[PDB]
């Protein structure tokens, strides 16, 4: 113990906040020191020793055990999506391990130089980032095209996350990992093109949504999710944000039995006596009927630390299977605005 290191973080909807912060100091693979602080964006006066060391920084890790883990074990850590994540709790943040040289005495990472000692990354504090993303509606609007405007309307009931990847990694240039488990707020029996074999319903990936105007830029409605690469060997596995409700007559009255027969035969509603219909949006996906703001290019994946804000316009009937190929959802378009969170202090 002939050195100390102190580390300060870079600080500037429901933007990133640090509830707990842990700094680990590695001598090769072996953890030399670990120290945490609560409700702060720095950890200071960590006792260690001079030499080549690696700093690993994690925030909001809850009950995760970090003491004594090797560097390899820490870089292999995973997380699962949870109900509390949907309240923006437990939104883990990490920075990639960074290699430094500590000298005897006090060392500082990211400070302004006024402290003396050995200044590392002076005036360049450590940037940490969420591993989760958010997908949410900021508008749902019905604007039926000419063959549907005098026939149909839509009464919303719920919004859902479908084909949500259950776990991810926490470090690496891409966090999407080889586990094949997925979660949904809706049914596991759609047996569609996008339906994964390892699939579990969770109530907390659905929300009631009965007023069509509730979703706004100021009040987005959606879910937090983990990194997921859509192109898989078994088929496409896109993370989907979906609104579900009932297809109605244009003035809101219930469809007649003859109308429901036609709509069921067309694949739009669940049954000839069940006018339930779905409008799924493949998040961050490249499709002709999706546009992205300001020259952004969709990547066909969920990427960490991103907000995908979706304005959905319904222009005709939906589909009775939200895990059908996207081409079956022929009557909607999407305007998507993408942003990254920054840490606020």
Short mmCIF file of C-alpha atoms in Angstrom, two decimals:
data_model
loop_
_atom_site.label_atom_id
_atom_site.label_comp_id
_atom_site.label_asym_id
_atom_site.label_seq_id
_atom_site.Cartn_x
_atom_site.Cartn_y
_atom_site.Cartn_z
CA UNK A 1 0.00 0.00 0.00
CA UNK A 2 2.37 2.74 -1.17
CA UNK A 3 -0.09 4.57 -3.46
CA UNK A 4 -3.64 5.88 -3.63
CA UNK A 5 -5.87 6.45 -6.66
CA UNK A 6 -8.92 8.72 -6.89
CA UNK A 7 -11.30 8.66 -9.89
CA UNK A 8 -13.86 11.29 -10.93
CA UNK A 9 -16.56 10.71 -13.56
CA UNK A 10 -17.52 12.90 -16.50
CA UNK A 11 -20.79 14.71 -15.79
CA UNK A 12 -22.85 17.13 -17.86
CA UNK A 13 -35.57 11.35 -20.26
CA UNK A 14 -34.81 10.28 -16.71
CA UNK A 15 -31.17 10.85 -17.57
CA UNK A 16 -28.39 8.75 -16.10
CA UNK A 17 -27.73 9.09 -12.36
CA UNK A 18 -25.29 7.22 -10.13
CA UNK A 19 -26.79 5.62 -7.02
CA UNK A 20 -23.67 3.59 -6.24
CA UNK A 21 -20.19 3.67 -7.77
CA UNK A 22 -17.48 1.01 -7.48
CA UNK A 23 -13.84 1.40 -8.54
CA UNK A 24 -11.59 -1.66 -8.79
CA UNK A 25 -7.79 -1.60 -9.12
CA UNK A 26 -6.17 -4.57 -10.88
CA UNK A 27 -2.56 -5.79 -10.82
CA UNK A 28 -2.77 -7.98 -13.89
CA UNK A 29 -5.71 -10.34 -13.41
CA UNK A 30 -5.69 -9.98 -9.61
CA UNK A 31 -7.88 -7.44 -7.83
CA UNK A 32 -5.56 -5.33 -5.67
CA UNK A 33 -8.20 -2.91 -4.34
CA UNK A 34 -11.93 -2.19 -4.46
CA UNK A 35 -13.82 0.79 -3.04
CA UNK A 36 -17.37 2.06 -3.45
CA UNK A 37 -19.24 5.30 -2.75
CA UNK A 38 -22.98 5.97 -2.63
CA UNK A 39 -24.84 8.89 -4.28
CA UNK A 40 -21.64 10.32 -5.78
CA UNK A 41 -19.79 10.57 -9.10
CA UNK A 42 -16.29 9.96 -7.71
CA UNK A 43 -14.45 7.48 -5.48
CA UNK A 44 -11.33 8.77 -3.73
CA UNK A 45 -8.33 7.66 -1.66
CA UNK A 46 -8.28 4.03 -2.80
CA UNK A 47 -5.26 2.33 -1.20
CA UNK A 48 -3.14 0.31 -3.63
CA UNK A 49 0.45 0.12 -4.83
CA UNK A 50 2.58 1.79 -7.50
CA UNK A 51 3.12 0.18 -10.90
CA UNK A 52 1.11 -0.72 -13.98
CA UNK A 53 -2.52 -1.11 -12.88
CA UNK A 54 -5.93 -1.34 -14.53
CA UNK A 55 -8.96 0.65 -13.33
CA UNK A 56 -12.45 -0.86 -13.73
CA UNK A 57 -15.46 1.28 -12.87
CA UNK A 58 -19.10 0.19 -12.51
CA UNK A 59 -22.22 1.99 -11.28
CA UNK A 60 -25.64 0.90 -10.02
CA UNK A 61 -24.72 -2.79 -9.72
CA UNK A 62 -26.99 -3.53 -6.75
CA UNK A 63 -26.41 -6.94 -5.20
CA UNK A 64 -23.69 -7.93 -7.70
CA UNK A 65 -20.66 -9.46 -5.96
CA UNK A 66 -17.45 -7.76 -7.11
CA UNK A 67 -14.98 -8.24 -4.24
CA UNK A 68 -12.11 -10.53 -5.19
CA UNK A 69 -13.24 -11.18 -8.76
CA UNK A 70 -10.44 -11.48 -11.29
CA UNK A 71 -10.24 -9.10 -14.23
CA UNK A 72 -11.45 -11.88 -16.53
CA UNK A 73 -14.39 -12.62 -14.23
CA UNK A 74 -15.44 -8.96 -14.10
CA UNK A 75 -15.28 -8.55 -17.88
CA UNK A 76 -17.43 -11.69 -18.18
CA UNK A 77 -20.19 -10.39 -15.88
CA UNK A 78 -23.75 -10.39 -17.22
CA UNK A 79 -27.05 -8.81 -16.22
CA UNK A 80 -30.70 -9.79 -16.68
CA UNK A 81 -33.58 -7.48 -17.50
CA UNK A 82 -35.80 -6.85 -14.46
CA UNK A 83 -39.09 -5.29 -13.40
CA UNK A 84 -37.21 -2.62 -11.46
CA UNK A 85 -35.28 -1.71 -14.63
CA UNK A 86 -38.66 -0.58 -16.00
CA UNK A 87 -38.75 2.05 -13.23
CA UNK A 88 -35.21 3.13 -14.29
CA UNK A 89 -33.77 1.45 -11.19
CA UNK A 90 -30.68 -0.73 -11.39
CA UNK A 91 -29.59 0.77 -14.73
CA UNK A 92 -26.00 -0.46 -14.58
CA UNK A 93 -23.27 1.75 -16.03
CA UNK A 94 -19.73 0.75 -17.00
CA UNK A 95 -16.57 2.12 -18.54
CA UNK A 96 -14.09 -0.11 -20.31
CA UNK A 97 -11.09 -1.10 -18.17
CA UNK A 98 -8.33 1.47 -18.59
CA UNK A 99 -4.62 0.81 -18.05
CA UNK A 100 -2.63 3.39 -16.08
CA UNK A 101 0.69 3.84 -14.32
CA UNK A 102 0.46 4.65 -10.62
CA UNK A 103 3.43 6.19 -8.86
CA UNK A 104 4.10 6.17 -5.14
CA UNK A 105 1.91 8.61 -3.26
CA UNK A 106 -1.40 10.07 -4.39
CA UNK A 107 -2.64 9.54 -7.94
CA UNK A 108 -5.65 11.23 -9.54
CA UNK A 109 -7.66 10.24 -12.62
CA UNK A 110 -9.73 12.93 -14.32
CA UNK A 111 -9.10 15.80 -11.87
CA UNK A 112 -8.19 19.42 -12.66
CA UNK A 113 -4.57 19.27 -11.44
CA UNK A 114 -4.97 21.47 -8.35
CA UNK A 115 -4.60 18.44 -6.04
CA UNK A 116 -0.91 17.87 -6.71
CA UNK A 117 0.27 14.29 -6.75
CA UNK A 118 0.42 12.31 -9.98
CA UNK A 119 -2.25 13.53 -12.40
CA UNK A 120 -3.58 10.96 -14.88
CA UNK A 121 -6.04 11.95 -17.61
CA UNK A 122 -5.98 15.49 -16.26
CA UNK A 123 -9.10 17.53 -17.10
CA UNK A 124 -10.51 14.40 -18.81
CA UNK A 125 -12.79 12.63 -16.31
CA UNK A 126 -13.88 9.04 -16.80
CA UNK A 127 -16.93 8.54 -19.03
CA UNK A 128 -19.29 5.76 -17.93
CA UNK A 129 -22.42 4.70 -19.83
CA UNK A 130 -25.63 2.75 -19.30
CA UNK A 131 -25.79 -0.80 -20.60
CA UNK A 132 -29.58 -0.52 -21.08
CA UNK A 133 -31.49 1.24 -23.86
CA UNK A 134 -35.01 2.69 -23.84
CA UNK A 135 -37.69 2.21 -26.48
CA UNK A 136 -40.83 4.28 -26.10
CA UNK A 137 -43.74 5.83 -27.94
CA UNK A 138 -43.73 9.62 -28.04
CA UNK A 139 -46.82 9.61 -30.28
CA UNK A 140 -49.47 7.17 -31.44
CA UNK A 141 -51.82 8.69 -34.00
CA UNK A 142 -54.56 7.19 -36.20
CA UNK A 143 -54.58 8.58 -39.76
CA UNK A 144 -56.39 5.98 -41.86
CA UNK A 145 -55.73 5.87 -45.61
CA UNK A 146 -58.60 6.16 -48.06
CA UNK A 147 -59.84 2.54 -48.07
CA UNK A 148 -59.98 2.45 -44.26
CA UNK A 149 -60.88 5.97 -43.13
CA UNK A 150 -64.65 5.44 -43.51
CA UNK A 151 -64.47 1.85 -42.23
CA UNK A 152 -62.15 1.50 -39.23
CA UNK A 153 -60.68 3.09 -36.15
CA UNK A 154 -58.48 1.80 -33.33
CA UNK A 155 -59.17 1.62 -29.59
CA UNK A 156 -55.84 1.03 -27.79
CA UNK A 157 -55.55 -1.28 -24.77
CA UNK A 158 -51.88 -2.08 -24.04
CA UNK A 159 -48.29 -1.46 -25.05
CA UNK A 160 -45.73 -4.27 -24.93
CA UNK A 161 -42.10 -5.20 -25.33
CA UNK A 162 -41.81 -8.33 -27.50
CA UNK A 163 -38.74 -10.47 -28.28
CA UNK A 164 -36.78 -8.63 -25.59
CA UNK A 165 -33.34 -10.15 -24.99
CA UNK A 166 -33.18 -11.43 -21.41
CA UNK A 167 -29.50 -10.87 -20.63
CA UNK A 168 -26.42 -9.08 -21.92
CA UNK A 169 -22.78 -8.53 -21.10
CA UNK A 170 -21.54 -5.43 -19.30
CA UNK A 171 -18.17 -4.78 -21.01
CA UNK A 172 -16.97 -4.96 -24.60
CA UNK A 173 -17.42 -3.11 -27.90
CA UNK A 174 -20.76 -4.94 -28.19
CA UNK A 175 -22.74 -6.16 -25.19
CA UNK A 176 -25.06 -8.58 -27.03
CA UNK A 177 -24.16 -12.07 -25.86
CA UNK A 178 -24.65 -15.72 -26.78
CA UNK A 179 -27.50 -16.50 -24.36
CA UNK A 180 -30.69 -17.33 -26.27
CA UNK A 181 -33.39 -16.41 -23.73
CA UNK A 182 -36.01 -13.77 -24.57
CA UNK A 183 -38.87 -12.14 -22.68
CA UNK A 184 -42.24 -10.73 -23.70
CA UNK A 185 -45.03 -8.71 -22.16
CA UNK A 186 -47.56 -10.53 -24.36
CA UNK A 187 -48.11 -14.17 -25.41
CA UNK A 188 -45.47 -16.84 -26.01
CA UNK A 189 -47.64 -18.85 -28.44
CA UNK A 190 -47.77 -16.61 -31.54
CA UNK A 191 -45.48 -19.03 -33.42
CA UNK A 192 -44.35 -16.30 -35.81
CA UNK A 193 -41.24 -15.71 -37.91
CA UNK A 194 -39.71 -13.67 -35.08
CA UNK A 195 -40.79 -15.89 -32.15
CA UNK A 196 -37.80 -17.35 -30.28
CA UNK A 197 -37.71 -20.91 -28.99
CA UNK A 198 -36.59 -19.76 -25.51
CA UNK A 199 -39.41 -17.37 -24.58
CA UNK A 200 -40.95 -16.32 -21.26
CA UNK A 201 -43.86 -14.00 -20.49
CA UNK A 202 -43.34 -11.33 -17.82
CA UNK A 203 -46.16 -9.02 -16.74
CA UNK A 204 -43.80 -6.06 -16.35
CA UNK A 205 -43.10 -5.83 -20.10
CA UNK A 206 -46.69 -4.71 -20.65
CA UNK A 207 -48.48 -1.53 -19.66
CA UNK A 208 -52.09 -0.41 -19.85
CA UNK A 209 -52.55 2.08 -22.69
CA UNK A 210 -56.17 3.15 -23.20
CA UNK A 211 -55.91 6.85 -24.16
CA UNK A 212 -54.42 7.22 -27.62
CA UNK A 213 -52.97 10.64 -26.81
CA UNK A 214 -51.16 9.65 -23.59
CA UNK A 215 -47.80 9.16 -25.31
CA UNK A 216 -46.04 12.50 -25.87
CA UNK A 217 -42.47 13.74 -26.17
CA UNK A 218 -42.74 14.88 -22.55
CA UNK A 219 -44.46 11.66 -21.39
CA UNK A 220 -42.96 8.77 -23.39
CA UNK A 221 -44.49 5.34 -22.85
CA UNK A 222 -42.24 2.32 -23.17
CA UNK A 223 -39.63 -0.02 -21.71
CA UNK A 224 -35.97 -0.42 -20.87
CA UNK A 225 -34.19 -3.21 -22.75
CA UNK A 226 -30.77 -4.83 -23.22
CA UNK A 227 -28.48 -5.17 -26.24
CA UNK A 228 -29.65 -7.64 -28.87
CA UNK A 229 -28.35 -8.41 -32.38
CA UNK A 230 -31.34 -9.10 -34.60
CA UNK A 231 -29.71 -11.34 -37.23
CA UNK A 232 -29.50 -14.79 -35.63
CA UNK A 233 -29.03 -18.26 -37.08
CA UNK A 234 -32.54 -19.37 -36.04
CA UNK A 235 -34.06 -16.32 -37.75
CA UNK A 236 -34.54 -12.60 -37.17
CA UNK A 237 -35.01 -11.71 -33.48
CA UNK A 238 -35.90 -8.01 -33.50
CA UNK A 239 -36.75 -6.23 -30.27
CA UNK A 240 -40.30 -4.96 -30.79
CA UNK A 241 -42.31 -2.15 -29.22
CA UNK A 242 -45.98 -2.89 -29.86
CA UNK A 243 -49.40 -1.34 -29.26
CA UNK A 244 -52.43 -3.63 -29.01
CA UNK A 245 -56.11 -2.80 -29.03
CA UNK A 246 -59.36 -3.37 -30.88
CA UNK A 247 -60.19 -2.60 -34.50
CA UNK A 248 -63.50 -0.68 -34.47
CA UNK A 249 -65.80 1.02 -36.93
CA UNK A 250 -64.62 4.46 -38.02
CA UNK A 251 -66.80 6.19 -35.40
CA UNK A 252 -65.66 3.88 -32.58
CA UNK A 253 -68.65 1.52 -32.61
CA UNK A 254 -67.96 -2.25 -32.63
CA UNK A 255 -67.41 -4.02 -35.93
CA UNK A 256 -70.33 -6.14 -37.14
CA UNK A 257 -70.05 -9.93 -37.48
CA UNK A 258 -69.72 -9.61 -41.27
CA UNK A 259 -66.98 -7.00 -40.84
CA UNK A 260 -65.11 -9.19 -38.35
CA UNK A 261 -65.32 -12.14 -40.75
CA UNK A 262 -63.70 -10.06 -43.48
CA UNK A 263 -61.07 -8.63 -41.11
CA UNK A 264 -60.18 -12.06 -39.69
CA UNK A 265 -59.92 -13.56 -43.19
CA UNK A 266 -57.55 -10.69 -44.06
CA UNK A 267 -55.27 -11.53 -41.12
CA UNK A 268 -55.97 -8.27 -39.29
CA UNK A 269 -57.77 -9.43 -36.12
CA UNK A 270 -57.35 -12.37 -33.76
CA UNK A 271 -60.68 -14.13 -34.49
CA UNK A 272 -63.97 -13.67 -36.32
CA UNK A 273 -65.41 -12.76 -32.88
CA UNK A 274 -62.30 -11.00 -31.48
CA UNK A 275 -61.32 -7.68 -33.09
CA UNK A 276 -58.00 -7.51 -31.22
CA UNK A 277 -55.26 -6.17 -33.50
CA UNK A 278 -51.55 -5.38 -33.07
CA UNK A 279 -49.19 -2.72 -34.41
CA UNK A 280 -45.56 -3.80 -33.88
CA UNK A 281 -42.51 -1.60 -34.43
CA UNK A 282 -39.10 -3.20 -34.94
CA UNK A 283 -36.85 -0.87 -32.95
CA UNK A 284 -33.76 0.62 -34.65
CA UNK A 285 -34.56 -1.47 -37.73
CA UNK A 286 -34.08 -0.52 -41.39
CA UNK A 287 -37.48 -0.47 -43.11
CA UNK A 288 -38.92 1.67 -45.92
CA UNK A 289 -41.82 2.83 -43.72
CA UNK A 290 -39.48 3.91 -40.89
CA UNK A 291 -37.66 7.25 -40.94
CA UNK A 292 -34.96 8.40 -38.53
CA UNK A 293 -34.18 11.99 -37.60
CA UNK A 294 -31.08 13.95 -38.65
CA UNK A 295 -29.38 11.46 -40.96
CA UNK A 296 -29.19 8.66 -38.39
CA UNK A 297 -28.68 5.13 -39.78
CA UNK A 298 -30.48 2.24 -38.03
CA UNK A 299 -28.25 -0.65 -37.00
CA UNK A 300 -30.73 -3.58 -36.70
CA UNK A 301 -29.84 -4.05 -33.03
CA UNK A 302 -30.54 -2.61 -29.60
CA UNK A 303 -27.49 -0.50 -28.66
CA UNK A 304 -26.63 0.44 -25.08
CA UNK A 305 -27.24 3.98 -23.78
CA UNK A 306 -29.64 4.87 -26.61
CA UNK A 307 -33.17 6.27 -26.45
CA UNK A 308 -35.30 5.18 -29.44
CA UNK A 309 -38.33 7.51 -29.39
CA UNK A 310 -41.04 6.33 -31.78
CA UNK A 311 -43.87 8.34 -33.33
CA UNK A 312 -46.28 5.72 -34.68
CA UNK A 313 -48.91 6.60 -37.28
CA UNK A 314 -51.56 3.93 -37.83
CA UNK A 315 -52.93 4.11 -41.40
CA UNK A 316 -55.03 0.95 -41.60
CA UNK A 317 -55.79 -2.34 -39.89
CA UNK A 318 -53.12 -4.07 -37.83
CA UNK A 319 -52.07 -7.71 -37.72
CA UNK A 320 -53.29 -10.61 -35.62
CA UNK A 321 -49.72 -11.84 -35.00
CA UNK A 322 -47.18 -9.19 -33.91
CA UNK A 323 -44.31 -11.65 -34.45
CA UNK A 324 -45.17 -11.99 -38.17
CA UNK A 325 -42.68 -10.63 -40.70
CA UNK A 326 -42.69 -6.82 -40.73
CA UNK A 327 -44.18 -6.89 -44.25
CA UNK A 328 -47.46 -8.19 -42.73
CA UNK A 329 -47.85 -4.90 -40.81
CA UNK A 330 -48.66 -3.06 -43.99
CA UNK A 331 -50.54 -0.07 -42.55
CA UNK A 332 -48.27 1.93 -40.28
CA UNK A 333 -45.31 4.24 -40.48
CA UNK A 334 -42.72 5.34 -37.94
CA UNK A 335 -40.71 8.50 -37.31
CA UNK A 336 -37.92 7.73 -34.83
CA UNK A 337 -35.69 10.15 -32.92
CA UNK A 338 -32.55 8.64 -31.39
CA UNK A 339 -30.46 10.13 -28.59
CA UNK A 340 -27.80 8.99 -26.14
CA UNK A 341 -27.93 9.68 -22.41
CA UNK A 342 -25.22 11.55 -20.58
CA UNK A 343 -24.43 11.34 -16.89
CA UNK A 344 -25.81 14.22 -14.82
CA UNK A 345 -24.17 15.17 -11.54
#
